[PDB]
């Protein structure tokens, strides 16, 4: 009957799920791929614009990792 | 004497320990490389100041640090603002990294064994000019040869200034002082008066009369009126004695030491309370340092704080000092009166009030011997009082002391609980108040009372993790004193999350001390916490006198009440205050868990009301997340599961986030939410599944925890199981189950990923195929129109520069993949059974012996085996020994990059009889797969698709032997159809049950009868023809009623009859949810019907057009929109160019309302760009449409203010996602050529 959770651990999962969602990104070229690009541009555009927020916040998530690691050397 | 170079060092030796709690120490030295890079750039300089200044240098010193300012003090180290640096003045040395195991003196004494206590004689503290003068200048009798003149004595100054070499011997000679040679002492021969301890800039003509008012030499020259001018300066306004030794002896005897009920192991504890002096008549807060505060003592004074905050302790130092030889302030008085007694106050009183401290030995003591003697001398009088108001009637303190100073003008420090100030402040001088407790004195304390057992080491690491959740935890050292019990388990604790353990102790502390009658206590705790109830309600901490009625405590104000709440000095009289945000947050849980005590029933309805204000899942994981732990902490068996019911009830099903953020400004009390929430939200934004998947963990985390208060058996079991159903999670939950025990858990799915690498391929560059579009030229208008734009590089770096931050955290981790006990506490039982293990992989970077030999056993006890892969094309044969158990993977295999060739000889040799296969890219081989493919295969649907590559027919001129259970298939015509392809596909389908077809580009060519004549009962239909037939399409294609979806595009060809033939049969056969409309032939005329009767569809989503707008199409939508029948539709789009015209979007936006059934609408692909008024009409878009996640419009190019029109009227409906107004623009010139015109 002892509570167990770790915040220093919490971030790891958060790191994990980011790279998992660079994966869900999907795109399909074509022999035409121009008319496709028409559609696909947005598709990528959204995906990209979507992703940037993910990977951006991914850092924002890990942004707090680095100092605590370093600052302990100073403690 | 300065020095140079000699890069210093910090200990590598023991630091291998910390590498456990942190990641890797080997990267520490790299940080310390900055130090020599920094130090050299600093002035190595030389002597500056004697220590007593240095405390001021630490005014801005960051409080959170390990070492104590007063540790640096005796080191005399100056505090420089650059980084944290502190500076040896006698030595040269300068330090950054602090050590818990090591006092500063060491580091100074170790590293530069030269000038400091080796008595090169730099500096002095506790400085007086009495022990410089009063006693000393006595012996200075004959201390020199005869001097009547200042020149011959000036000569003596030859020796004086190694300390200084700053203040001129002249000016002192100009004041006529003599250097005797002992230390730096200088003396005025006439008055015989001396001084020392010279701050640069000290005038004697300043100093002299202050310390020697009656000096004749002075008074014979400088005249008079000058003095009261000069007299203005910093320091304070300036058995008869045998009774004092008693006073001395009293404190000299042991009374105060061993005040902590633990033990007095260190009886004198030097860690000191940070005092602030606030000004009465204007706001200035004037931070101070204690030794300074000493000399600041003039007459009456404040000494303000709350409770257990150091009230008595601080004064107590004075005496135990005042007796002993120490810092100046003491050395002036021959009397100190310490009485903390409120008990005396009712009394008419006596000198015997003091006899409390006397312990008898009195009786000549009399108003005679006191009162007029107390005014005999004015100044050596001193009192120390714990008391307030002045209400107690005493000729002594009341009728005399605080009332009339200018009869007395004597000094007092008054311990005052904060709530007692605002009655007697007007008599009271400028403030002496306590900011809070410096986090270091704690760490100072925690040093002493412990053997430093790497309990404190384990502390800060938390208080690095938590920040606001940490650095504000300590306010009263009493909280430390609560910890100071320090047996609690064996100690403070060896246990993680030291927040509760603090609080958890602190309560049951106050029990003990105050448990004589604890009935009022709990009652107070109970009735006040109803305020803490409002913690969940909102953050409003004002707590006026009124809402206290809901708490009911009010002015009843038992001394107990203070231990929670306080007041605040007013700008305007009605006001109030409370202790601290975190302590409050924990009060709530306790008060909360008073409710949900099942033996209380009528009232627990309250909590039942509260806990239902948690309604979002994101309130659970962030907002009150840290709070709920306080609840689980206090651990009342009956409550917890009843709570758990609510929480596990929360997800419902298929409602992702009812409200992504209901967040208040309560969040500020914890920062991480802002990060997490977005991270959460963002995560949700890419993958609706994984969001709910992720969120499911922390709930289950939270869930299981409350169960592990006491009893998971009865009330816990049923709730969880419901939650578990149909879910998909990640293997971290396994070890995360303590719950691993009860059952091999079912009714769910599980995911796993391995990705270590950065991306490698050309798949993005197809913008190169957008180059022929003259992308150089188009950009023209909008002084802003830049702001609309990005370039690949510009974005490329943005992304990569951020991965670089990961890259740091990548290396220092000596860390790879899951399963500590995660597989083992998983596999601790033998008969584990796992239904589905989902595996996404990217690169071989995790290919390794043990790491996979770990994953070797993962596959065991997991009944189905799935895969999706990108980066690695070769990871298969890396697996084989892991799967040489032939564990029957089956399920499906997703692939992007290459098949490794002789790899799938494995997938051959596997022979699990897979259900399905997914390969959408690169190339494939039969000697990869399609050789003898069917034999053990034939189960469920496949995808094999390539870009331009031929030989998709040669895929299976082996398949006709096979007799398939597939019934579901996906593949294209990789040419303008070759009868082979048909001949390939033909025989198949009549012999199979024909479900869910997918074809990328069917070249319709000839005899799609031989394709679609057999077509029956499909849902999936993906064909998009470049060349048509329009026999099947018009005839048999819409002869099969039940269909959810259609994927169709690629140039509907112009027989408007055929369009009708479609349109009619489209309208005639309508079962559909959704579709892809074929791309127009000029359809536009009749595409009204492709709207008009689309009201008939029983279900709606995914409305799709690449064509057909400019005509009435809009109200044709809007009619069908305003009138019902497109209700519950999920989507809208158009990709057009021609059919794009501004003119009607407003008309399209004329009335778009009354469909809050929708998600996204996209208007896009302008080579030209589209910027006009109808951005006006946007002000009504999101507002009246209610529910939308998001939009995509790439035409907008909007005025930023009109984008302020966007961004401002965006969020009125929601907190969450938005329209995407900018693409990643292929890198191009962005010309202003029209701007040439203005
Ligand atoms: N620098 C310190 N080092 C060690 N212990 C301290 C320090 N400062 C305060 N404490 C502890 O905190 C407590 C401060 O309470 P104190 O007795 O000063 O207040 P009080 O006059 O009794 O009124 P109240 O107790 O309501 O504050 C003391 O009991 C002392 O043990």
Numbering used by the authors:
A (entry chain C): 421 to 495
B (entry chain A): 10 to 247, 404 to 1403
Authors' text:
After 3D classification, a subset of 1 663 317 particles was used for image reconstruction, generating a map with a global resolution of 4.28 Å, as determined with a gold standard Fourier shell correlation (FSC). The NBD, HD1, WHD, HD2 and LRR domains of NAIP5 are similarly positioned to those of an active NLRC4, indicating the structure of NAIP5 represents an active state. Located between NBD and HD1, clear electron density that is not from NAIP5 likely defines an ATP molecule. The ATP is coordinated by residues exclusively from NBD and HD1 of NAIP5. The structure revealed that the flagellin forms two helices and interacts with multiple domains of NAIP5, including N-terminal domain (NTD), BIR1, helical domain 1(HD1), insertion domain (ID) and LRR of NAIP5, which functions to stabilize the active conformation of NAIP5. FliC-C forms extensive interactions with NAIP5 via packing against NTD, BIR1, HD1, HD2, ID and LRR of NAIP5, supporting the observation that the C-terminal 35 resides of flagellin are necessary and sufficient for NAIP5 activation. The extreme C-terminal side of FliC-C binds to a deep hydrophobic pocket formed by NTD, BIR1 and HD1. The central region of FliC-C is sandwiched between ID and one helix from HD2 of NAIP5 mainly via van der Waals and hydrophobic contacts. In the structure, the arginine residue of FliC_D0L binds to a pocket of NAIP5 with a limited size and tightly packs against residues 106-109 from BIR1.
The nucleotide-binding domain (NBD)- and leucine-rich repeat (LRR)-containing (NLR) proteins are a family of intracellular receptors that play an important role in regulation of innate immune response. Neuronal apoptosis inhibitory protein (NAIP)-NLR containing a caspase activating and recruitment domain (CARD) 4 (NLRC4) complexes are ones of the most fully characterized NLR-containing inflammasomes. In mice, the specificity of the inflammasomes is conferred by NAIPs, with NAIP5/6 and NAIP2 recognizing bacterial flagellin and the T3SS component PrgJ, respectively. Ligand recognition results in NAIP interaction with NLRC4 and consequent NLRC4 activation.
